[PDB]
Amino acid sequence: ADQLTEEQIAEFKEAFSLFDKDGDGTITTKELGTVMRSLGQNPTEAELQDMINEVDADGNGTIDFPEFLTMMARKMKDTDSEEEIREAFRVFDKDGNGYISAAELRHVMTNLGEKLTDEEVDEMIREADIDGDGQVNYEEFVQMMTAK
Numbered sequence: 782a783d784q785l786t787e788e789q790i791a792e793f794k795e796a797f798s799l800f801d802k803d804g805d806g807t808i809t810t811k812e813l814g815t816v817m818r819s820l821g822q823n824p825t826e827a828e829l830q831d832m833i834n835e836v837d838a839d840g841n842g843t844i845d846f847p848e849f850l851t852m853m854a855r856k857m858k859d860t861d862s863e864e865e866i867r868e869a870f871r872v873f874d875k876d877g878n879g880y881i882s883a884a885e886l887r888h889v890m891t892n893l894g895e896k897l898t899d900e901e902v903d904e905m906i907r908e909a910d911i912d913g914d915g916q917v918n919y920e921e922f923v924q925m926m927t928a929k
């Protein structure tokens with residue numbers, strides 16, 4: 782009956798130590814690839830794999846913690862985006878009473894570009910999602926992103 786639970790939040794908290802679990806403190810593609818299990822199959826990493834090494838190839842396909850927070854901070858917007866996404870609810874979600882499915886989401890992602898994989902969302906939304914029915918909405922948008 783309860784959709785929001787503390788357990789769900791703990792997942793993100795635990796994942797924090799999961800990345801460094803490999804060693805004392807290090808962020809590498811191997812660590813990220815591990816998360817693939819919780820997501821079953823998230824190409825998002827496959828395509829990015831090259832992107833990570835490219836920008837990370839400055840010294841090694843690994844990123845230090847001091848830079849990890851900065852990178853995630855800029856890449857991921859704080860929870861304050863909730864208000865910003867609020868305006869996007871009407872435009873992003875025309876139906877309003879309805880939610881965007883994975884199939885419809887793909888069409889939107891296509892218009893954006895093709896830098897990332899096309900399957901990332903199709904499979905990521907399939908496993909990582911408890912419902913498995915794939916659905917995106919304003920309420921979920923806030924939980925989707927959380928830099929802090």
Ligand SMILES: COc1cc(CNC(=O)CCCC/C=C/C(C)C)ccc1O
Nearest residue numbers: 813825829833852856857886890902917
């Ligand atoms: C540094 O590159 C990395 C960035 C992230 C951050 N992860 C994300 O941004 C997940 C992608 C969000 C998918 C959005 C789908 C919408 C259209 C519904 C994780 C690991 C990394 O290696």
Ligand SMILES: [Ca+2]
Nearest residue numbers: 804805806807
């Ligand atoms: Ca490490």
Ligand SMILES: [Ca+2]
Nearest residue numbers: 837843844845
């Ligand atoms: Ca680095």
Ligand SMILES: [Ca+2]
Nearest residue numbers: 879880881882
């Ligand atoms: Ca929709």
Ligand SMILES: [Ca+2]
Nearest residue numbers: 910912915916
């Ligand atoms: Ca869902």
